[PDB]
Scaffold this active site. Structure first.
Site, PDB file in Angstrom:
ATOM      1  N   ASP A  51       0.985  -1.190  -0.019  1.00  0.00           N
ATOM      2  CA  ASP A  51       0.015   0.109   0.036  1.00  0.00           C
ATOM      3  C   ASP A  51       1.022   1.334  -0.013  1.00  0.00           C
ATOM      4  OD1 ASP A  51      -1.826   2.005   0.005  1.00  0.00           O
ATOM      5  OD2 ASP A  51      -2.872   1.107   1.836  1.00  0.00           O
ATOM      6  N   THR A  52       1.068   1.773  -1.242  1.00  0.00           N
ATOM      7  CA  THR A  52       1.808   3.357  -1.162  1.00  0.00           C
ATOM      8  C   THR A  52       1.168   4.207  -0.613  1.00  0.00           C
ATOM      9  OG1 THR A  52       1.166   3.449  -3.560  1.00  0.00           O
ATOM     10  CG2 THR A  52       2.777   2.331  -3.344  1.00  0.00           C
ATOM     11  N   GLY A  53      -0.320   4.192  -0.614  1.00  0.00           N
ATOM     12  CA  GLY A  53      -0.965   5.219   0.058  1.00  0.00           C
ATOM     13  C   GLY A  53      -0.797   5.118   1.769  1.00  0.00           C
TER      14      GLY A  53
END
Ligand SMILES: CC(C)(C)NC(=O)[C@@H]1CN(Cc2cccnc2)CCN1C[C@@H](O)C[C@@H](Cc1ccccc1)C(=O)N[C@H]1c2ccccc2C[C@H]1O
Lengths: 99, 99
Positions: free
Chosen positions: B25-27
Site C-alpha cells: 500500500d503506497t498510500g
C-alpha cells in the site's frame, strides 16, 4: 517515472481543468478527490477504508491527467482526507509495483 | 518482482511466526496488521484512514518478511479491515511505483 517511497508519492493531477496534488495509492481500489465542482452527472456512492465509510459523488468517464499521463475513468468526489489516485486509474497509466 | 494493479496487490508476509496475506500500500504511511498477540512492549496510537481514526498498538523493531524479503520496523496492530504494508516497510524492501 520510477518513484521511491521515502516520502508520500504525491503528484500533480489535472481534473476539470484544475491542478491538484494527489497521492498514488496502490491500496485504494478507487479514486477519490476532495469536494470540488466538477463537470459531469454523478450518482451517490459510499466507500470504506480504515476508520469507516464516507459518502461520495460518483462521476463516470472523467478525463484526468496524472503526472502527465492521461486517464479517463471513474472519479469519486467527497470528504476524503487527501486526494487519492487508486487502482482504477493507476492501471490506466500503466503503473506497477516493483521490488 | 513486478506486481500489476488489476487486482489488489496482495502478498504473503511472515510476522510473529505466522503467515498472513497483506496489501502492498503506497498510500499508507504505516503498516497495520490485524489483531494478533505479538509479544512485549507496545505504545497506544491512533491512526487516520479515509473514514476516520482507529485505535492500534504500536510495536517497534518487529521482524517481518514480505514476499520473501526480510525487514524490520514498526508494526501497528488493531482492528484493520485488511493487513496493510505501508511505506515504512515498502522502502525497506526496495519497492517502487513505476509508469
Ligand atoms: C496507515 C493507514 C493504513 C491508516 N493509512 C491509510 O488508511 C491511508 C489514509 N489516507 C488518508 C489520511 C488520513 C489521515 C492522515 N493522513 C492521511 C488515505 C490513504 N490511506 C491508504 C489506503 O490505501 C488504505 C486502504 C485500506 C483498505 C484497503 C481495502 C479495503 C479496506 C481498506 C483504503 O482505505 N482503501 C479503500 C479506498 C480508498 C479510496 C477509494 C476507495 C477505497 C476502497 C478501499 O480500497
Amino acid at each position: 517515472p520510477q518513484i521511491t517511497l521515502w516520502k508520500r508519492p504525491l503528484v500533480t493531477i489535472k481534473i476539470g481543468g484544475q491542478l491538484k496534488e494527489a497521492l498514488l495509492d496502490t491500496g485504494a481500489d478507487d479514486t477519490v478527490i476532495e469536494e470540488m465542482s466538477l463537470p459531469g452527472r454523478w450518482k451517490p456512492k459510499m466507500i470504506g477504508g480504515v476508520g469507516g465509510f464516507i459518502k461520495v459523488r460518483q462521476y463516470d468517464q472523467i478525463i484526468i491527467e496524472i503526472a502527465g499521463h492521461k486517464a479517463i475513468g471513474t472519479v469519486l468526489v467527497g470528504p476524503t482526507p487527501v486526494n487519492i489516485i487508486g487502482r482504477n486509474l493507476l492501471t490506466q497509466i500503466g503503473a506497477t509495483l516493483n521490488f
